[PDB]
Amino acid sequence: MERTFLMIKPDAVQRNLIGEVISRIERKGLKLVGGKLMQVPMELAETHYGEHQGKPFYNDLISFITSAPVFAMVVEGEDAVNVSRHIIGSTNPSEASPGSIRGDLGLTVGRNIIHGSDSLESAEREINLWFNENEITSYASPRDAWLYE
């Protein structure tokens, strides 16, 4: 079943919104399958974000993501990548639909609560970069037969 990588960013951690953000992911029907609070080492940050190395904001993005712990997640469900992006909302919290994590909780592009993989391909990369096979569990849940048919 499809998986994506989500990460609760240091702004959410420092605003004490960890539980609230998990709750929104959970209630949507997505299954938390891996999860760890962690300080992000500099090279993880640079390899996770290098698409952006050239850009002006780059050195701010790296400083921010390493400034306090993040909550790294692997999340499972039918169409999980797009589902996550859907409930997370647009990159810019002022464009993100009310009701979405970024729409309800964030102000600025740079401080936008959470990260989600933008595609199937980057999901498998991101999951691989952040987690080892043995940190990601597999389990049936009571609601599974009620989420899907």
Place this chain on the structure above:
Amino acid sequence: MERTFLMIKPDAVQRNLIGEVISRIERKGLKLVGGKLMQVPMELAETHYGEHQGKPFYNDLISFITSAPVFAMVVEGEDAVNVSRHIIGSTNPSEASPGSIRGDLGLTVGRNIIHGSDSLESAEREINLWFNENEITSYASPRDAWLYE
């Protein structure tokens, strides 16, 4: 005053979301005027979903809606039919706006939490099919003068 038929579906029931869903209906200003927890008899399911008799998904719909109790509702308010459809969101929870019942709580089209009448005529038909007039109460509420002009 306008009325529509809503039904909390077995997925929501089995996921223990009854209160949450009623809360969203209630806080919107809609007045719960009829409500019952019920097992759906096969015939009621078939006549309720009659339009879909021919379609591939039909049997699955009938099995699903009869698999565990639903919470059947009559709800009252200005423009109730449309208001309900608005807060419920698009049929497909992945298209439904974040903040809507389906947008926040559902994953798949077949397991999408709640039903709402799609029009005025199907509202009276569904109300009639699921409830007897003596099951539908009428009452003034303190907030009525504050919801409307």
Place this chain on the structure above:
Amino acid sequence: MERTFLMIKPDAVQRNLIGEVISRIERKGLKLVGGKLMQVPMELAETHYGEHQGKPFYNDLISFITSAPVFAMVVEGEDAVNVSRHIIGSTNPSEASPGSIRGDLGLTVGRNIIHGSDSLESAEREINLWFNENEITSYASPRDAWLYE
């Protein structure tokens, strides 16, 4: 830093939603900088709503806004005017996005829970009309460095 004027209307007050609405404002990252529960004098209502002095709905506007206390607010943050309008939602709660204050809480245009300044000009205008300089506080908050760069 940018400021706008918000006012929780008497329908919201009389529906006991004051805390709920403040919570939505608060969690978005906006900083409450002035706040007062107040009966609106006729004099203020008429000048506040002076644009509409010719229109059919005008008297109803004035009656309604003076019919019970409102909670008047000055709210601060980057792009605060548009950020407030965004989480408040469209004038008509049936057009407002689910997840917005109006989309989740209101039914009719006339009874739509909250007001927010429509522009920078009228923010400045409304802030001045409703509050005195000494009623609006200025303060740093712990989360400020985590909302913005």
